[PDB]
């Protein structure tokens, strides 16, 4: 099978997040469709899996703001997150598990991974640049820095 | 297209009767109608004929005009005939309609009467055969406010009609004449 | 070796045996054989079997309100698609939802913005073709049971009626795809030497004359606009797939046939036609004169979408003793196919552009017989009756029953 | 098959006309049910036909003011005319056509034909008679005349 | 035939096919036991 | 039975049978795949 995910790449802070991972060339018989998150500041983490009967399971650390639904008509399953803070920026995968023992089960048939960036900033020009990374040409180019306010800053010297 | 036909064809009983439908690019079809009776197909292509038809009905086509031939004319053949072809834009088009009459009784002259009002002027025309009668009015002829009765069969079985006109009480004109035409014969009767 | 479901059909054998009988003369008849009617009944019943596990779609036809969709549409086919905005029951049976769908003019009628209703639910409710099932034809081999033998014609000059000098038997028929067509036979089995003419009575104009090509002519029918499909839920587990917003411009569906190859093929047909009528008869081809849409227009399927083609630019010529002809093929969705009262189809739209490359094998013409001993015969396309579509593929077959008993005089005695 | 019509014999001017032709002893499979009109001043003239899936075909001269509907439940089909003027008085037949090519097709199974007369007059008495033809006895009785206003007049003399 | 519209239809019924529910509200006798199949 | 008049009924379903849709509203767990068949 092949799994493809889709969703917005920019969501505002304290806003309900949405994602949708579709399944092609297969069926949802006897599989645990799961969601996985790769963060750079906290490593790999687990979100939750869902079975085709509507029976769900979630991670205990994210319980209370996560909800995963299934729809076998359009052959896809979806994630929803609630009250997303600034620390939830990561890349999100969708994977599958075989039915049975989860003690030796390993995640297989991974997706591409849609990168989701969270923010609460606004449009502001640089004072020598949140919506657009500005380019300076006159030298060497240095990468940008994310501040705690959600802004950007760079430097360039010849 | 219009599929032009002769308006009326009159033949003696016992001989043939030919009707022509012109301007037909495609195969023709003929229908006959009688008053107070459902129409029946008689010749459903160029030459064929359906079951249950007498042997006096046949048709042929040469070029773009098609002719229907009658072998015997009787009292049961006094009917109108319509020719029919197929066209791409208007799916069915029909002809004008040819009337076939048989001479059961000989030619007799019509009789006309005229009456003055106390305000409509009446011209009554009775007892003529056959029914092909055209009328005319004179004063200087007038084209305004005249209506003609269609011919019909009475208990005499010999056709009659009428002609009416309404006149504003110009009683200016000192002469008023009503004219009849029956296959050549003209009778003039008239006056203040 | 889909609608034509072979999961309930037995697999065939590899390399089926064929025995060439030598001193036999069999009186074949392609117009009175009984396997064609059994094929038609099997196709109808199997089609109805394949329609059983799909969506019923009976509550759909609520009073529709349709505007003209007109966005950057081209000059021709203006006012064909409609933007209807109706509202429907959802998964919960106490709420509704206002939705929109795109429909053709040939699926909706006016009932009196003006209100519209579907053309189907004055007579019956259409049944959706649920989208796992495809309409592509696959070959089907007809076998014979024990005691019955299938005799196959092998005369190369065979008009379908009369005796055959060379007869061979076989247990299995060849690959016979149940192709859908009305005027131009598609993907059929070709002839061998010339183009052949088969009919009931060649001096009778009420019987469909049938011709089979020697070389194929390629046809490319495609639909250029980029439509999309959206899923609208009408209940707990039943989904109706409506046409979404179109990406790009709006164009009509083209159909291409090469001009010179079709002219050569028509030359072959008119050369083989005049052996039945005379060497001085002027032969003309005019376009069809049908009453409904299926007889007027060439109709087929393209993997989910049903086409209806004008085909006036092909049958327009007279014959006296890299340019491609284009045809404005048009699309309809509601399908009343096997001409039964009160049963129909909703075909869902196919996402993305669609392309079909096929080739024409036979034509179903109809004579226009004016009068006897004339000098001009004009031919028109036609059909509609689906028995003649499969009669061009089952002509070289017949079924017989063996009676192995027999008596003969001899000199012997039983003791 | 036998066909029979049913409808009003007097229709007021600028009003919607309606007629219904029923079918007995047959089925609606593969026939073109049609309508025909016989005017005494315009000859025989075609109205339109309907097929059993609702595929209609009207005459181009009367397109926009005619409507033919088919119903497979009560085994009948109907005609509707809109904005009827005084020149549409005729007798109306219903006939069928076979499915196939119309190039040689002919109308068969004709009905009786119900006369429909359209008027725009009112009730009045003769000044020596729209609702009742009056009889005068004292001579000769002669047929009536329809005026352009829709009234009647006769004459009688000994 | 339209799912949103309704009409007013009258008919005659015999006394053995209707029952009084709680003086002008009646229902068919078959409603609380079955659903009848009309002989086509 | 009379298909114009509704009623307000009450029942006891289990926790493993209802899903929150978001005094709070609820739906059955099996009403996005297929309707059931009650065992006679
Ligand atoms: C194939 O079709 C032809 C017509 O294209 C059939 O031949 C026709 O057969 C009919 C019926 O027997 C003949 O009609 C009869 O003709 C004469 C008067 O002409 C008379 O005996 C009868 O009153 C009757 O009308 C007809 O002449 C004949 N020929 C033509 C040119 O039409 C032929 O029978 C058909 N073949 C088969 C095998 O069915
Ligand atoms: C078979 O081919 C013929 C000839 O090409 C087609 O007939 C033509 O049909 C079109 C249909 O649109 C007619 O155009 C329309 O005609 C009138 C003109 O007064 C008007 O209403 C419209 O503006 C429009 O132009 C066209 O006149 C007609 N040609 C002739 C000579 O009658 C026919 O449609 C084809 N039939 C089939 C079934 O494919
Ligand atoms: C006559 O036979 C030809 C043989 O090529 C048929 O064309 C083939 O039609 C099928 C069904 O529409 C096409 O399959 C489809 O193709 C694409 C890509 O896989 C996709 O849309 C579907 O998954 C499906 O597989 C096939 O590509 C096409 N072949 C070619 C070479 O174009 C044709 O349909 C037949 N014509 C009839 C039955 O009228
Ligand atoms: C099937 O194709 C034929 C091809 O002849 C179509 O007949 C032609 O249709 C056009 C468009 O309706 C008619 O109008 C003419 O078009 C152009 C401008 O676009 C111009 O030559 C004229 O001013 C006129 O408007 C045309 O008269 C007509 N006939 C011919 C002989 O060309 C036919 O409409 C198509 N049928 C169907 C059912 O789609
Ligand atoms: C068909 O009509 C609907 C409305 O009934 C159109 O949908 C609206 O499209 C406009 C223009 O983009 C948007 O602002 C609205 O939000 C849409 N409304 C809804 C409910 O979707 C639709 O675009 C039309 N389809 C066409 C023209 O193809
Ligand atoms: C379903 O659609 C119809 C129209 O198709 C809606 O009818 C509207 O009703 C309101 C009052 O409830 C009127 O003010 C509007 O004018 C109507 N609209 C139109 C276009 O006529 C109807 O409300 C919709 N919803 C439901 C739940 O039935
Ligand atoms: C059928 O043939 C026509 C005419 O050759 C093709 O139409 C042309 O297609 C090309 C490529 O798509 C366009 O650039 C031209 O503008 C078209 N010519 C016109 C509109 O006059 C058509 O694409 C062919 N269809 C096929 C091969 O499916
Ligand atoms: C129908 O489409 C096919 C496939 O595109 C066309 O066949 C191609 O024709 C060109 C002509 O120059 C050749 O170069 C290609 O090699 C052909 N491809 C194949 C796969 O055969 C065909 O010409 C089209 N038919 C028409 C226009 O009548
Ligand atoms: C269905 O309804 C009918 C009509 O009310 C019931 O029949 C009557 O039931 C009452 C119950 O008290 C009896 O006293 C009557 O004698 C019954 N009448 C007849 C004619 O049978 C019937 O019992 C109901 N069925 C159910 C609830 O299963
Ligand atoms: C919608 O289409 C119809 C049919 O062609 C036309 O009469 C009407 O004017 C069109 N309306 C608009 C706004 O273009
Ligand atoms: C049609 O297409 C053009 C070109 O893509 C697009 O810009 C435009 O919005 C569309 N509409 C009109 C009215 O031109
Ligand atoms: C078929 O050909 C045979 C052999 O010439 C001939 O007897 C028969 O009449 C032909 N049939 C038709 C329909 O042409
Ligand atoms: C004609 O159509 C068949 C359909 O199977 C295709 O395979 C073939 O390539 C085509 N051409 C021929 C036989 O020349
Ligand atoms: C149709 O639209 C989709 C969605 O934008 C696009 O990916 C696809 O390439 C389009 N197809 C064509 C043939 O232009
Ligand atoms: C017609 O031409 C063919 C082919 O040359 C020939 O065999 C035949 O005799 C000709 N028939 C007549 C009647 O001239
Ligand atoms: C059809 O043929 C006629 C001549 O018979 C010609 O004038 C006309 O242009 C042709 N039409 C088409 C669409 O090929
Ligand atoms: C349906 O349920 C709602 C919510 O409890 C209530 O307001 C209404 O009265 C109920 N009954 C009906 C419409 O008969």
Q: Does D46 lie at the interface with B, CB-CB under 8 angstroms? A: yes
CA gap D35, D49 in Å, rounded: 6
Closest residue to atom 4 of ligand 13, CA basis: C187
Using a CB-CB distance cutoff of 8 angstroms, which residues of chain C are in contact with residue B60?
371
Chains touching C by CB (3 or more pairs below 8 Å): A, B, D, E, F
* Bridge-based pairing state of the strands A17-24 and A10-12: unpaired
Handedness of CA D26, D31, D37, D43 (dihedral sign): negative
Query: What are phi and psi for residue C390, nearest 5 degrees?
Result: -95, -5
Query: What tokens does B76 get?
Result: 């049961």
CA-based nearest residue in chain C for residue A71: C237
Query: What tokens does A86 get?
Result: 């600034």
**In contact, C257 and C221? CB cutoff 8 Å:** no
CA gap A5, D7 in Å, rounded: 65
The conformational region for residue C147 under phi > 0 = left, psi -120 to 50 = alpha, else beta, is: left
For D8, D16, D35, D82, D116, the CA distances from D11, given in Å and listed in that order, are 7, 8, 18, 11, 7
For B126, C73, C243, C329, the CA distances from C79, given in Å and listed in that order, are 61, 9, 16, 16
All residues at 6 or more sequence positions from C53 whose CB lies less than 8 Å from its CB, including other chains: C130
Report the Cα C220 to chain-centroid distance in Å. Answer: 16
Furthest C-alpha separation in chain F? 33
CA gap B178, B167 in Å, rounded: 14
| CA of residue D42 to ligand 3 center, whole Å | 55
CA gap C40, C45 in Å, rounded: 9
The experimental technique behind this entry is cryo-EM
Which of B25, B26, B92 is the best residue to mutate to test the C interface, defined by the most C CB atoms within 10 Å of its own CB?
Answer: B26
State which of C156, C161, C163, C164 you would mutate to test the pocket of ligand 12, scoring each by most atoms of that ligand within 8 A of its C-beta.
C161
Instruction: Please give the full DSSP string across chain B, using - where no structure is assigned.
Output: ------SEEEE-TTS-EEEEE-S-SS--EEEEE-TTS--EEEE-SSS---SS--TTEEEEEETTEEEEEES---GGG--EEEEEEE-SSSSEEE---EEEEE-SS--B--EEEEE----EEEEEEEEEBSS-EEEEEE--B--SSEEEPPPB--TT-SEEEEEEEE-------S--EEEEEETTB--EE---
Q: Which of B41, B86, B162 sits opposite D108 (nearest CB)?
A: B41
Q: Resolution of this PDB entry, in A?
A: 3.7
All residues at 6 or more sequence positions from B97 whose CB lies less than 8 Å from its CB, including other chains: B5, B7, B80, B81, B82, D43, D44
Q: Does E1 lie at the interface with C, CB-CB under 8 angstroms? A: yes
Using a CB-CB distance cutoff of 8 angstroms, which residues of chain E are in contact with residue F2?
27, 31
Strand partners, C28: C162
Query: What tokens does D23 get?
Result: 């079918």
Using a CB-CB distance cutoff of 8 angstroms, which residues of chain F are in contact with residue A72?
33
Cβ of C189 below 6 Å from ligand 13: no
**In contact, A26 and A95? CB cutoff 8 Å:** no
For B42, B102, C89, C119, D108, the CA distances from B54, given in Å and listed in that order, are 9, 18, 65, 46, 18
Ligand 4: lining residues by beta carbon, under 6 Å? C 310, 312, 328
Chains touching B by CB (3 or more pairs below 8 Å): C, D
Q: Which of B108, B103, B154 is nearest to B133 (CA)?
A: B108
Interchain pair E1, C122: CB under 8 A = yes
| Coil vs helix vs strand at C259 | helix
CA gap B16, B69 in Å, rounded: 7
Interchain pair C237, F27: CB under 8 A = no
Interchain pair D46, B93: CB under 8 A = yes
Closest residue to atom 3 of ligand 12, CA basis: C162
**Rounded to a whole number, what is the distance in Å from the CA of D69 to chain C's nearest CA?**
10
Query: What tokens does D62 get?
Result: 């009367």
Strand partners, A94: A35
| CA of residue C67 to ligand 4 center, whole Å | 27
Residue spans of beta strands (DSSP E) within chain D: 2-6, 10-12, 17-24, 31-39, 43-50, 56-58, 66-71, 76-81, 90-98, 114-119, 145-146, 152-153
CA gap D23, D36 in Å, rounded: 16
Q: Which of A75, A68, A92, A73 is nearest to A11 (CA)?
A: A92
With 0-12 / 13-18 / 19 or more C-beta atoms within 10 angstroms meaning exposed / middle / buried, residue A119 is: middle
**Rounded to a whole number, what is the distance in Å from the CA of B93 to chain C's nearest CA?**
15
Query: What tokens does D76 get?
Result: 């009948």
Query: What are phi and psi for residue A117, nearest 5 degrees?
Result: -110, 130
Q: Which DSSP symbol is given to C304?
A: S
* C164 membership: H or E segment, kind and range: strand C161-164
All residues at 6 or more sequence positions from C155 whose CB lies less than 8 Å from its CB, including other chains: C164, C165, C166
CA-based nearest residue in chain D for residue B88: D103
Q: Does A26 lie at the interface with C, CB-CB under 8 angstroms? A: no
Interchain pair C91, F33: CB under 8 A = no
CA gap C334, C46 in Å, rounded: 20
* Bridge-based pairing state of the strands B146-148 and A31-39: unpaired
For B29, C39, C180, D53, the CA distances from C183, given in Å and listed in that order, are 27, 20, 10, 20
State which of C76, C257, C312, C327 you would mutate to test the pocket of ligand 4, scoring each by most atoms of that ligand within 8 A of its C-beta.
C312
* C293 membership: H or E segment, kind and range: helix C293-296
């Amino acid at each position: 099978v092949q799994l493809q995910e889709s969703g917005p790449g920019v969501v505002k802070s304290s806003e309900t997040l949405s994602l949708t991972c579709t399944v092609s060339g297969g069926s949802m018989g006897g599989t645990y469709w799961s969601w996985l998150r790769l963060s750079p500041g906290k490593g790999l983490e687990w979100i939750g899996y869902i079975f085709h009967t509507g029976e769900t399971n979630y991670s205990p650390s994210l319980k209370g703001r996560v909800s995963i639904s299934v729809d076998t008509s359009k052959n896809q399953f979806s994630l929803r997150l609630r009250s997303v803070t600034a620390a939830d920026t990561a890349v999100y995968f969708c994977a599958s598990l075989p039915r049975g023992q989860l003690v030796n089960a390993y995640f297989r048939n991974w997706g591409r991974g849609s990168l989701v960036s969270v923010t609460a900033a606004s449009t502001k020009g640089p004072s020598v640049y949140f919506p657009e990374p500005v380019t300076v040409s006159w030298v060497h180019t240095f990468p940008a820095v994310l501040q705690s306010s959600g802004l950007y800053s760079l430097s360039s010297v010849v | 297209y219009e599929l032009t036909q002769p308006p009326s064809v009159s033949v003696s009983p016992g001989q043939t009767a030919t009707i022509t439908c012109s301007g037909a690019s495609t195969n023709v079809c003929w229908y006959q109608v009688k008053p107070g009776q459902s129409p029946e197909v008689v010749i459903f292509e160029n030459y064929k004929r359906p079951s249950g038809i007498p042997d006096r009905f046949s048709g042929s086509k040469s070029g773009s005009t098609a002719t229907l031939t009658i072998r015997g004319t009787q009292a049961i053949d006094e009917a109108d005939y319509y020719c029919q072809v197929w066209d791409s834009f208007s799916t069915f088009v029909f002809g004008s309609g040819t009337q076939v009459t048989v001479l059961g009784q000989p030619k007799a002259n019509p009789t006309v009467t005229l009456f003055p009002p106390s305000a409509t002027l009446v011209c009554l025309i009775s007892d003529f055969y056959p029914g092909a009668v055209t009328v005319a009015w004179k004063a200087s002829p007038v084209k305004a406010g005249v209506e003609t009765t269609t011919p019909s069969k009475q208990s005499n079985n010999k056709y009659a009609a009428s002609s009416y006109l309404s006149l504003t009480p110009q009683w200016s004109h000192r002469s008023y004449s009503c004219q009849v035409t029956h296959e050549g014969s003209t009778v003039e009767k008239t006056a203040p | 070796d889909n609608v034509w479901a072979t999961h309930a059909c037995v697999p065939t054998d590899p390399n089926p045996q064929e025995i060439h009988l030598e001193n036999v003369t069999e009186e074949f008849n392609m117009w009175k054989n009984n396997m064609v009617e059994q094929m038609h009944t099997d196709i109808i019943s199997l089609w109805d079997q394949s329609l059983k596990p799909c969506v019923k779609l009976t509550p759909l036809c609520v009073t529709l309100q349709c505007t003209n969709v007109t966005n950057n549409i081209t000059d021709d086919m203006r006012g064909e698609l409609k933007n209807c905005s109706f509202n429907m029951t959802t998964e919960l049976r106490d709420k509704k939802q206002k939705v929109y769908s795109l429909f053709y003019r040939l699926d909706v009628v006016q009932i009196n913005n003006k209100e519209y209703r579907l053309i189907n639910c004055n007579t019956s409710a259409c049944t959706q073709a649920c989208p796992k099932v495809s309409f592509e034809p696959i070959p089907i081999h007809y076998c014979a049971p024990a005691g019955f033998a299938i005799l196959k014609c092998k005369d190369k000059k065979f008009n379908g009626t009369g005796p055959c000098p060379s007869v061979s038997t076989v247990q299995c028929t060849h690959g016979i795809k149940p192709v859908v067509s009305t005027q131009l036979l598609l993907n059929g089995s070709l002839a061998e030497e010339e183009v052949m003419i088969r009919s009931e009575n060649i001096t009778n104009n009420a019987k469909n004359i049938l011709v089979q090509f020697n070389t194929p002519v390629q046809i490319n029918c495609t639909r250029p606009n980029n439509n999309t499909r959206k899923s609208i839920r009408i209940g707990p587990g039943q989904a109706f797939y409506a046409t979404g917003d179109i990406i790009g411009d709006i164009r009509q569906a083209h159909c291409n046939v090469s001009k010179a190859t079709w002219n050569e093929t028509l030359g072959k047909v008119v050369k083989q036609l005049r052996k039945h009528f005379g060497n001085n008869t002027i032969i003309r081809f005019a376009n069809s004169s049908g009453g409904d849409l299926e007889v007027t227009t060439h109709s087929f399927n393209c993997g989910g979408e049903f086409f209806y083609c004008n085909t006036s630019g092909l049958f327009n010529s007279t014959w006296i003793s890299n340019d491609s002809i284009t045809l404005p093929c048009r699309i309809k969705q509601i399908i009343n196919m096997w001409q039964r009262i009160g049963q129909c189809m909703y075909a869902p739209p196919i996402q993305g552009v669609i392309r079909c490359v096929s080739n024409i094998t036979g034509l179903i013409l109809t004579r226009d017989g004016g009068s006897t001993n004339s000098t001009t015969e004009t031919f028109r396309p036609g059909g509609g009756d689906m028995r003649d579509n499969w009669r061009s593929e089952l002509y070289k077959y017949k079924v017989v029953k063996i009676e192995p008993l027999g008596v003969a005089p001899t000199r012997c005695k039983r003791r």
